[PDB]
Design a protein around this ligand. Structure first.
Ligand SMILES: CC(C)CN(C[C@@H](O)[C@H](Cc1ccccc1)NC(=O)O[C@H]1CO[C@H]2OCC[C@H]21)S(=O)(=O)c1ccc(N)cc1
Lengths: 99, 99
């Protein structure tokens, strides 16, 4: 689709078997999801935004479905206030910004 | 133009007479710039991101030059780690996400 920005650009994703709403976020390097119990190997990481840093669990090579696009990559899990789809996955769905 | 997301979508803006680099940020409701002087009336606001909230100066009706496009809207100034162009101004340049 072509998504305008008058409202937040929210999409449905599926990850670890669960459906979620997430924000398509060109300002995010990495995808970051709210706290959930994902199985798999992970390593700790700190990410910085407005307000400072959060500790996240970094899971590599995770399958995610985003509006019908089946992708595989890194997902960070921790205390973000909103589920965010970052550039690492935006590039896999072929997302561009146009003006 | 159409901007891919392999790299951060960084652009040159002009605000208050000065050239700056900024991030085109679809996950930001609002435009937030690093501490700077700016003429005009302002009022204090809190804005919230990953890590918590920061206190900013809200200036309304500020002209911003973005990639050759002159727009006018709200600019928040404060201790953000990066200059971020949010939807309030992305909409003014006709920006969309496409995939
Ligand atoms: C500040 C950016 C350089 C990076 N941020 C992404 C950004 O799009 C967040 C994404 C975001 C969105 C909502 C809540 C938290 C974070 N937006 C944000 O801080 O916007 C603020 C300014 O306008 C307001 O509207 C939304 C919050 C305010 S970030 O969330 O901190 C972030 C940082 C690193 C990664 N990997 C993923 C996300």
């Amino acid at each position: 689709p072509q998504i305008t920005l008058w409202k937040r650009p929210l999409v449905t994703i599926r990850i670890g078997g669960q459906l979620k709403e997430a924000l398509l976020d060109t300002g995010a390097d990495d995808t970051v999801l709210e706290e959930m119990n994902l199985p798999g190997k992970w390593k700790p990481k700190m990410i910085g935004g407005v307000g400072g840093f959060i500790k996240v669990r970094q899971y590599d090579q995770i399958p995610v479905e985003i509006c019908g696009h089946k992708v595989i990559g890194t997902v960070l899990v921790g205390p973000t206030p909103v589920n965010i789809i970052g550039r690492n996955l935006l590039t896999q769905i072929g997302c561009t910004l146009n003006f």
